[PDB]
Every structure is written in structure tokens, then in C-alpha cells.
Amino acid sequence: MSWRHIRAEGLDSSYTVLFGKAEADEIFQELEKEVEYFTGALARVQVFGKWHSVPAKQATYGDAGLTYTFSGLTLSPKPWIPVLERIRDHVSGVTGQTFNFVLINRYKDGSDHICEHRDDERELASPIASVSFGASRDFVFRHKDSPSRRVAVVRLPLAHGSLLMMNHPTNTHWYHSLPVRKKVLAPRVNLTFRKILLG
DNA sequence: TCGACAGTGAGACA
DNA sequence: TGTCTCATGTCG
Ligand SMILES: [Mg+2]
């Protein structure tokens, strides 16, 4: 496989094109058709007098019997459906890793974005694999100390059919964003595969 | 609650 | 002047 290695102080990611266009088109259509997102209908749930947010506008699938936590609650993901198994297997096939969980986000146009954040490290093992379909969207890495010092910025279009692996310690020293882009009008679907520890 | 996203001011440039 | 990009406040 042909990989672009994105390297900098505390940043190890690599990027490749996982699926050719024909196949990326097919899979995208199947995703749009088949994935079931949480609606907005239920925002919060309260226990012991303290509220807890409930996932909205995302879908989670994973292995039977698995549980993950979210905003303090413990959930079960939907069991895998075939298009996701197909995608998981290609990722596995090209990295040597296994994954038991995927978080799917849909960005219906360039107004949908994600603000700077660092993944919830607490429940993970190991590399996060991010697979993109639909419209190309720029993805941005900013160092968590850049205020103290001035560290470089790294900017990467995540293209249709692509795979971005984020390996240690990329998620420890750098925040990530998917910034707004008005010019972009078509939707993007992103799949983030993880391995949730049984411990 | 605290996580997703609304809101906003500075700067760029058309 | 108008839209965009970058980098604290709110609320369910
Ligand atoms: Mg993330």
C-alpha cells in the first residue's frame, strides 16, 4: 500500500486512499442508505440528580456484548451490518489491526464541523482509523501548547475513499478540528474505528 | 453536567 | 462593505 506519512513534533499519522472511486461511490451510497443515526429527540438523561448528555446525530456499531461510555453513561452499540464489516476488513487488511467499534458522523455540508478537541483516551487501548466518504473536507492539526510556544500547523484534505490512521502520540500532543467550509455543499460521512478495551 | 454548537470580534481580501 | 476564516457563551 502507498502511504503519506504526516510527521512533526509529537505527530504521527498516515494517510492513504483505501478505495478507488467506483468502489468508494458504491460504499458511500450503501452507507447513506443503511446507517441509522441517533436523532436529536433525546438530549439528556438524569441520574443521582446529575444530567448526562446522550449521543445525537451519530451512529455507533460494534461487536456483540461490547459496551462503551459516553458523557458518563454506559451504552451498547448496534451490531455490525455488512457494509461496515466490509469497510472494517479493508482497514484491517491494510494495517494489521483489528477493531471492535465504529463511530460514524455525518457532515451534511460545510457548515457542519467539529471544533478543536482531543479524543477520549480513557476507554481506548493504539491507532484510531478514520475513513471518509463523500465530499473532501480539510482536517486540521494544532499542537496543544501553541499560549506557550508556536508549533507548526498541518492541514490535510480527507478525500473520498481515504483512510487516516492516527497513531501515538498524535492524539496526546495535538488537538484536531474539521473546520467550516462554506464553498463545500455535498455531504461527508466519516467512520472512526477503535478498539475498546475489555478492561 | 459538560459536550456540541451557537455566538462573536479581529483580520484578510474581494 | 460583504463574506469568509480563525480562535467564549449557552443550554438541554
Ligand atoms: Mg475526534
PDB file of C-alpha atoms (C1' of nucleotides) and ligand atoms in Angstrom:
ATOM      1  CA  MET A   1       0.000   0.000   0.000  1.00  0.00           C
ATOM      2  CA  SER A   2       1.001   3.675  -0.717  1.00  0.00           C
ATOM      3  CA  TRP A   3       1.084   5.854   2.462  1.00  0.00           C
ATOM      4  CA  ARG A   4       1.754   9.504   3.049  1.00  0.00           C
ATOM      5  CA  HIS A   5       3.370   9.805   6.498  1.00  0.00           C
ATOM      6  CA  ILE A   6       2.414  13.003   8.249  1.00  0.00           C
ATOM      7  CA  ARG A   7       5.259  13.758  10.681  1.00  0.00           C
ATOM      8  CA  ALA A   8       6.015  16.570  13.147  1.00  0.00           C
ATOM      9  CA  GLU A   9       6.859  17.082  16.822  1.00  0.00           C
ATOM     10  CA  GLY A  10       4.508  14.687  18.605  1.00  0.00           C
ATOM     11  CA  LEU A  11       2.502  13.957  15.440  1.00  0.00           C
ATOM     12  CA  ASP A  12       2.334  10.556  13.820  1.00  0.00           C
ATOM     13  CA  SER A  13      -0.412   9.957  11.326  1.00  0.00           C
ATOM     14  CA  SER A  14      -0.502   8.450   7.907  1.00  0.00           C
ATOM     15  CA  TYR A  15      -2.919   8.732   5.013  1.00  0.00           C
ATOM     16  CA  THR A  16      -3.830   6.670   2.022  1.00  0.00           C
ATOM     17  CA  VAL A  17      -6.511   6.111  -0.448  1.00  0.00           C
ATOM     18  CA  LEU A  18      -8.285   2.947   0.608  1.00  0.00           C
ATOM     19  CA  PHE A  19     -10.929   2.669  -2.052  1.00  0.00           C
ATOM     20  CA  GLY A  20     -10.889   3.506  -5.717  1.00  0.00           C
ATOM     21  CA  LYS A  21     -13.579   5.841  -6.932  1.00  0.00           C
ATOM     22  CA  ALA A  22     -16.012   3.205  -8.294  1.00  0.00           C
ATOM     23  CA  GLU A  23     -15.874   1.324  -5.045  1.00  0.00           C
ATOM     24  CA  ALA A  24     -15.959   4.431  -2.893  1.00  0.00           C
ATOM     25  CA  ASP A  25     -19.130   5.579  -4.720  1.00  0.00           C
ATOM     26  CA  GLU A  26     -20.798   2.193  -4.182  1.00  0.00           C
ATOM     27  CA  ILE A  27     -19.967   2.074  -0.481  1.00  0.00           C
ATOM     28  CA  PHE A  28     -20.989   5.666   0.140  1.00  0.00           C
ATOM     29  CA  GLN A  29     -24.421   5.022  -1.406  1.00  0.00           C
ATOM     30  CA  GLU A  30     -24.760   1.947   0.727  1.00  0.00           C
ATOM     31  CA  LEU A  31     -23.846   3.898   3.857  1.00  0.00           C
ATOM     32  CA  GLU A  32     -26.321   6.706   3.129  1.00  0.00           C
ATOM     33  CA  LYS A  33     -28.953   4.108   2.563  1.00  0.00           C
ATOM     34  CA  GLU A  34     -28.200   1.867   5.540  1.00  0.00           C
ATOM     35  CA  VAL A  35     -26.695   3.682   8.515  1.00  0.00           C
ATOM     36  CA  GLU A  36     -29.091   4.733  11.323  1.00  0.00           C
ATOM     37  CA  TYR A  37     -28.100   7.864  13.170  1.00  0.00           C
ATOM     38  CA  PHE A  38     -29.364   8.823  16.599  1.00  0.00           C
ATOM     39  CA  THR A  39     -31.903  11.605  16.175  1.00  0.00           C
ATOM     40  CA  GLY A  40     -31.980  14.731  18.400  1.00  0.00           C
ATOM     41  CA  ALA A  41     -35.199  13.577  20.159  1.00  0.00           C
ATOM     42  CA  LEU A  42     -33.490  12.629  23.432  1.00  0.00           C
ATOM     43  CA  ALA A  43     -30.833  15.102  24.564  1.00  0.00           C
ATOM     44  CA  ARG A  44     -30.336  14.252  28.215  1.00  0.00           C
ATOM     45  CA  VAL A  45     -30.983  11.761  30.959  1.00  0.00           C
ATOM     46  CA  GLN A  46     -30.650  12.468  34.706  1.00  0.00           C
ATOM     47  CA  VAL A  47     -29.378  10.174  37.486  1.00  0.00           C
ATOM     48  CA  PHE A  48     -28.438  10.859  41.123  1.00  0.00           C
ATOM     49  CA  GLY A  49     -29.658  14.413  40.340  1.00  0.00           C
ATOM     50  CA  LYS A  50     -26.915  14.992  37.690  1.00  0.00           C
ATOM     51  CA  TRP A  51     -27.663  15.313  33.969  1.00  0.00           C
ATOM     52  CA  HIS A  52     -25.799  13.391  31.287  1.00  0.00           C
ATOM     53  CA  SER A  53     -25.868  14.084  27.547  1.00  0.00           C
ATOM     54  CA  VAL A  54     -26.998  11.344  25.188  1.00  0.00           C
ATOM     55  CA  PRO A  55     -25.410  10.892  21.755  1.00  0.00           C
ATOM     56  CA  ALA A  56     -27.067  12.842  18.938  1.00  0.00           C
ATOM     57  CA  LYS A  57     -26.511  12.869  15.141  1.00  0.00           C
ATOM     58  CA  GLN A  58     -24.053   9.991  15.202  1.00  0.00           C
ATOM     59  CA  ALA A  59     -24.226   6.211  14.882  1.00  0.00           C
ATOM     60  CA  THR A  60     -22.191   3.591  16.783  1.00  0.00           C
ATOM     61  CA  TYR A  61     -21.766  -0.037  15.760  1.00  0.00           C
ATOM     62  CA  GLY A  62     -19.548  -2.706  17.304  1.00  0.00           C
ATOM     63  CA  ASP A  63     -19.152  -6.276  18.484  1.00  0.00           C
ATOM     64  CA  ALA A  64     -21.975  -8.087  20.212  1.00  0.00           C
ATOM     65  CA  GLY A  65     -21.586  -7.777  24.014  1.00  0.00           C
ATOM     66  CA  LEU A  66     -19.428  -4.672  23.863  1.00  0.00           C
ATOM     67  CA  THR A  67     -20.183  -1.558  25.931  1.00  0.00           C
ATOM     68  CA  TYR A  68     -18.712   1.974  25.730  1.00  0.00           C
ATOM     69  CA  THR A  69     -19.199   5.029  27.867  1.00  0.00           C
ATOM     70  CA  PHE A  70     -20.461   8.424  26.802  1.00  0.00           C
ATOM     71  CA  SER A  71     -20.954  11.660  28.752  1.00  0.00           C
ATOM     72  CA  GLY A  72     -20.804   9.430  31.874  1.00  0.00           C
ATOM     73  CA  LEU A  73     -23.354   6.785  30.744  1.00  0.00           C
ATOM     74  CA  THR A  74     -22.652   3.246  29.501  1.00  0.00           C
ATOM     75  CA  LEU A  75     -24.146   2.198  26.125  1.00  0.00           C
ATOM     76  CA  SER A  76     -24.269  -0.776  23.760  1.00  0.00           C
ATOM     77  CA  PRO A  77     -23.529  -0.213  20.085  1.00  0.00           C
ATOM     78  CA  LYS A  78     -25.669  -1.526  17.217  1.00  0.00           C
ATOM     79  CA  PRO A  79     -24.425  -4.892  15.905  1.00  0.00           C
ATOM     80  CA  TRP A  80     -22.321  -4.669  12.736  1.00  0.00           C
ATOM     81  CA  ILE A  81     -24.117  -4.514   9.410  1.00  0.00           C
ATOM     82  CA  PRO A  82     -22.459  -5.786   6.263  1.00  0.00           C
ATOM     83  CA  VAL A  83     -21.163  -2.586   4.683  1.00  0.00           C
ATOM     84  CA  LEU A  84     -19.339  -1.767   7.906  1.00  0.00           C
ATOM     85  CA  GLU A  85     -17.819  -5.241   8.148  1.00  0.00           C
ATOM     86  CA  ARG A  86     -16.627  -4.787   4.582  1.00  0.00           C
ATOM     87  CA  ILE A  87     -15.017  -1.477   5.487  1.00  0.00           C
ATOM     88  CA  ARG A  88     -13.552  -2.780   8.763  1.00  0.00           C
ATOM     89  CA  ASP A  89     -11.962  -5.684   6.881  1.00  0.00           C
ATOM     90  CA  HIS A  90     -10.269  -3.464   4.313  1.00  0.00           C
ATOM     91  CA  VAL A  91      -8.817  -1.336   7.124  1.00  0.00           C
ATOM     92  CA  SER A  92      -7.672  -4.397   8.960  1.00  0.00           C
ATOM     93  CA  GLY A  93      -6.275  -5.770   5.729  1.00  0.00           C
ATOM     94  CA  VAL A  94      -4.106  -2.759   5.133  1.00  0.00           C
ATOM     95  CA  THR A  95      -2.891  -2.124   8.743  1.00  0.00           C
ATOM     96  CA  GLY A  96      -2.707  -5.464  10.543  1.00  0.00           C
ATOM     97  CA  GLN A  97      -5.135  -4.251  13.199  1.00  0.00           C
ATOM     98  CA  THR A  98      -8.483  -5.263  14.455  1.00  0.00           C
ATOM     99  CA  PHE A  99     -11.300  -3.031  15.501  1.00  0.00           C
ATOM    100  CA  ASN A 100     -14.398  -3.767  17.570  1.00  0.00           C
ATOM    101  CA  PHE A 101     -16.208  -0.392  17.402  1.00  0.00           C
ATOM    102  CA  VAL A 102     -17.003   2.394  14.907  1.00  0.00           C
ATOM    103  CA  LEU A 103     -18.375   5.872  15.418  1.00  0.00           C
ATOM    104  CA  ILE A 104     -19.998   7.351  12.327  1.00  0.00           C
ATOM    105  CA  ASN A 105     -20.524  11.072  11.865  1.00  0.00           C
ATOM    106  CA  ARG A 106     -22.327  12.742   9.032  1.00  0.00           C
ATOM    107  CA  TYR A 107     -21.458  16.288   7.921  1.00  0.00           C
ATOM    108  CA  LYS A 108     -24.273  17.267   5.602  1.00  0.00           C
ATOM    109  CA  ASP A 109     -22.407  20.278   4.230  1.00  0.00           C
ATOM    110  CA  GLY A 110     -19.543  22.596   5.045  1.00  0.00           C
ATOM    111  CA  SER A 111     -21.477  24.336   7.892  1.00  0.00           C
ATOM    112  CA  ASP A 112     -21.196  21.125   9.892  1.00  0.00           C
ATOM    113  CA  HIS A 113     -17.802  20.967  11.510  1.00  0.00           C
ATOM    114  CA  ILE A 114     -16.118  19.830  14.632  1.00  0.00           C
ATOM    115  CA  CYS A 115     -14.345  22.214  16.990  1.00  0.00           C
ATOM    116  CA  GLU A 116     -10.886  21.552  18.357  1.00  0.00           C
ATOM    117  CA  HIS A 117     -10.871  18.518  20.693  1.00  0.00           C
ATOM    118  CA  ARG A 118      -8.755  15.524  21.801  1.00  0.00           C
ATOM    119  CA  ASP A 119     -10.364  12.060  21.751  1.00  0.00           C
ATOM    120  CA  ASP A 120     -11.490  10.354  24.925  1.00  0.00           C
ATOM    121  CA  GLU A 121      -8.378   8.394  25.683  1.00  0.00           C
ATOM    122  CA  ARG A 122      -9.765   6.749  28.809  1.00  0.00           C
ATOM    123  CA  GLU A 123     -11.507   3.715  27.192  1.00  0.00           C
ATOM    124  CA  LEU A 124      -9.082   3.052  24.260  1.00  0.00           C
ATOM    125  CA  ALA A 125      -6.200   0.605  24.008  1.00  0.00           C
ATOM    126  CA  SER A 126      -3.338   2.077  19.746  1.00  0.00           C
ATOM    127  CA  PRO A 127      -4.404   3.617  16.417  1.00  0.00           C
ATOM    128  CA  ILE A 128      -7.693   5.345  15.573  1.00  0.00           C
ATOM    129  CA  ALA A 129      -8.670   4.763  11.886  1.00  0.00           C
ATOM    130  CA  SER A 130     -10.782   7.412  10.230  1.00  0.00           C
ATOM    131  CA  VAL A 131     -12.332   6.531   6.888  1.00  0.00           C
ATOM    132  CA  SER A 132     -14.017   9.197   4.755  1.00  0.00           C
ATOM    133  CA  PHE A 133     -16.653   9.154   2.062  1.00  0.00           C
ATOM    134  CA  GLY A 134     -18.456  11.873   0.143  1.00  0.00           C
ATOM    135  CA  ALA A 135     -17.051  15.360  -0.174  1.00  0.00           C
ATOM    136  CA  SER A 136     -13.443  16.118   0.582  1.00  0.00           C
ATOM    137  CA  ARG A 137     -13.048  18.114   3.809  1.00  0.00           C
ATOM    138  CA  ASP A 138      -9.947  19.670   5.245  1.00  0.00           C
ATOM    139  CA  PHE A 139      -8.775  18.334   8.549  1.00  0.00           C
ATOM    140  CA  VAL A 140      -6.545  20.308  10.804  1.00  0.00           C
ATOM    141  CA  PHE A 141      -3.983  19.549  13.456  1.00  0.00           C
ATOM    142  CA  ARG A 142      -2.936  22.110  16.085  1.00  0.00           C
ATOM    143  CA  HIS A 143      -0.388  21.358  18.881  1.00  0.00           C
ATOM    144  CA  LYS A 144      -1.831  21.590  22.442  1.00  0.00           C
ATOM    145  CA  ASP A 145       0.844  24.103  23.683  1.00  0.00           C
ATOM    146  CA  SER A 146       0.631  26.567  20.745  1.00  0.00           C
ATOM    147  CA  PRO A 147      -0.339  30.483  24.744  1.00  0.00           C
ATOM    148  CA  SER A 148       3.088  28.934  25.400  1.00  0.00           C
ATOM    149  CA  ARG A 149       5.081  28.384  22.212  1.00  0.00           C
ATOM    150  CA  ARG A 150       4.406  28.430  18.473  1.00  0.00           C
ATOM    151  CA  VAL A 151       4.159  24.948  16.936  1.00  0.00           C
ATOM    152  CA  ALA A 152       3.500  24.162  13.230  1.00  0.00           C
ATOM    153  CA  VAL A 153       0.061  23.656  11.714  1.00  0.00           C
ATOM    154  CA  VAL A 154      -0.766  20.664   9.493  1.00  0.00           C
ATOM    155  CA  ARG A 155      -3.582  20.692   7.014  1.00  0.00           C
ATOM    156  CA  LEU A 156      -4.858  17.672   5.184  1.00  0.00           C
ATOM    157  CA  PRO A 157      -7.797  17.183   2.843  1.00  0.00           C
ATOM    158  CA  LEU A 158      -9.609  13.954   3.697  1.00  0.00           C
ATOM    159  CA  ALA A 159     -10.670  12.721   0.336  1.00  0.00           C
ATOM    160  CA  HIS A 160     -13.391  10.345  -0.808  1.00  0.00           C
ATOM    161  CA  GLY A 161     -12.304   6.797  -0.104  1.00  0.00           C
ATOM    162  CA  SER A 162      -9.414   7.730   2.165  1.00  0.00           C
ATOM    163  CA  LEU A 163      -8.102   6.363   5.383  1.00  0.00           C
ATOM    164  CA  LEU A 164      -6.343   8.351   8.056  1.00  0.00           C
ATOM    165  CA  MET A 165      -4.582   6.477  10.830  1.00  0.00           C
ATOM    166  CA  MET A 166      -3.809   8.450  13.916  1.00  0.00           C
ATOM    167  CA  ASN A 167      -1.092   6.715  15.928  1.00  0.00           C
ATOM    168  CA  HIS A 168       0.539   7.568  19.254  1.00  0.00           C
ATOM    169  CA  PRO A 169       1.201  10.051  20.363  1.00  0.00           C
ATOM    170  CA  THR A 170      -0.708  12.169  17.822  1.00  0.00           C
ATOM    171  CA  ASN A 171      -3.819  12.272  19.985  1.00  0.00           C
ATOM    172  CA  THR A 172      -1.870  13.194  23.140  1.00  0.00           C
ATOM    173  CA  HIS A 173       0.069  16.367  21.967  1.00  0.00           C
ATOM    174  CA  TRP A 174      -2.263  17.772  19.208  1.00  0.00           C
ATOM    175  CA  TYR A 175      -5.916  18.951  19.055  1.00  0.00           C
ATOM    176  CA  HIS A 176      -7.888  18.198  15.935  1.00  0.00           C
ATOM    177  CA  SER A 177     -10.624  20.064  14.062  1.00  0.00           C
ATOM    178  CA  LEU A 178     -12.715  19.793  10.941  1.00  0.00           C
ATOM    179  CA  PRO A 179     -13.337  23.423  10.240  1.00  0.00           C
ATOM    180  CA  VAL A 180     -16.338  25.020   8.494  1.00  0.00           C
ATOM    181  CA  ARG A 181     -16.075  25.421   4.704  1.00  0.00           C
ATOM    182  CA  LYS A 182     -18.963  27.354   3.041  1.00  0.00           C
ATOM    183  CA  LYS A 183     -17.956  26.519  -0.510  1.00  0.00           C
ATOM    184  CA  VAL A 184     -18.463  22.802   0.243  1.00  0.00           C
ATOM    185  CA  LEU A 185     -22.104  21.806  -0.405  1.00  0.00           C
ATOM    186  CA  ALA A 186     -22.161  17.982  -0.577  1.00  0.00           C
ATOM    187  CA  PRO A 187     -22.305  15.657   2.452  1.00  0.00           C
ATOM    188  CA  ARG A 188     -19.413  13.783   4.091  1.00  0.00           C
ATOM    189  CA  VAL A 189     -19.501  10.577   6.102  1.00  0.00           C
ATOM    190  CA  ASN A 190     -16.686   9.657   8.403  1.00  0.00           C
ATOM    191  CA  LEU A 191     -16.111   6.394  10.197  1.00  0.00           C
ATOM    192  CA  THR A 192     -13.832   6.145  13.154  1.00  0.00           C
ATOM    193  CA  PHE A 193     -12.833   2.673  14.085  1.00  0.00           C
ATOM    194  CA  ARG A 194     -11.404   1.963  17.515  1.00  0.00           C
ATOM    195  CA  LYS A 195     -10.610  -0.893  19.726  1.00  0.00           C
ATOM    196  CA  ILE A 196     -12.413  -0.609  23.059  1.00  0.00           C
ATOM    197  CA  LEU A 197     -10.579  -2.354  25.913  1.00  0.00           C
ATOM    198  CA  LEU A 198     -12.444  -5.100  27.821  1.00  0.00           C
ATOM    199  CA  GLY A 199     -10.733  -3.759  30.967  1.00  0.00           C
TER     200      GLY A 199
ATOM    201  C1'  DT B   1     -23.286  18.195  33.820  1.00  0.00           C
ATOM    202  C1'  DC B   2     -20.374  19.006  30.139  1.00  0.00           C
ATOM    203  C1'  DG B   3     -20.392  18.174  25.160  1.00  0.00           C
ATOM    204  C1'  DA B   4     -21.985  20.018  20.683  1.00  0.00           C
ATOM    205  C1'  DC B   5     -22.545  24.146  18.564  1.00  0.00           C
ATOM    206  C1'  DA B   6     -24.067  28.993  18.770  1.00  0.00           C
ATOM    207  C1'  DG B   7     -22.140  33.429  19.061  1.00  0.00           C
ATOM    208  C1'  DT B   8     -18.626  36.883  18.286  1.00  0.00           C
ATOM    209  C1'  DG B   9     -14.584  40.101  17.192  1.00  0.00           C
ATOM    210  C1'  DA B  10     -10.168  40.583  14.533  1.00  0.00           C
ATOM    211  C1'  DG B  11      -8.052  40.117  10.262  1.00  0.00           C
ATOM    212  C1'  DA B  12      -7.879  39.047   5.356  1.00  0.00           C
ATOM    213  C1'  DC B  13      -9.240  40.183   0.803  1.00  0.00           C
ATOM    214  C1'  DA B  14     -12.679  40.736  -2.695  1.00  0.00           C
TER     215       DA B  14
ATOM    216  C1'  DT C   1     -18.691  46.775   2.572  1.00  0.00           C
ATOM    217  C1'  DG C   2     -19.762  41.668   2.460  1.00  0.00           C
ATOM    218  C1'  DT C   3     -18.443  37.126   3.084  1.00  0.00           C
ATOM    219  C1'  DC C   4     -15.220  34.115   4.888  1.00  0.00           C
ATOM    220  C1'  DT C   5     -11.813  32.055   8.234  1.00  0.00           C
ATOM    221  C1'  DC C   6      -9.760  31.686  12.624  1.00  0.00           C
ATOM    222  C1'  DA C   7      -9.821  31.048  17.527  1.00  0.00           C
ATOM    223  C1'  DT C   8     -16.131  32.352  24.790  1.00  0.00           C
ATOM    224  C1'  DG C   9     -21.049  31.502  25.950  1.00  0.00           C
ATOM    225  C1'  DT C  10     -25.403  28.522  26.204  1.00  0.00           C
ATOM    226  C1'  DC C  11     -28.274  25.091  27.260  1.00  0.00           C
ATOM    227  C1'  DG C  12     -30.920  20.652  27.382  1.00  0.00           C
TER     228       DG C  12
HETATM  229 MG    MG D   1     -12.067  13.256  17.345  1.00  0.00          MG
END
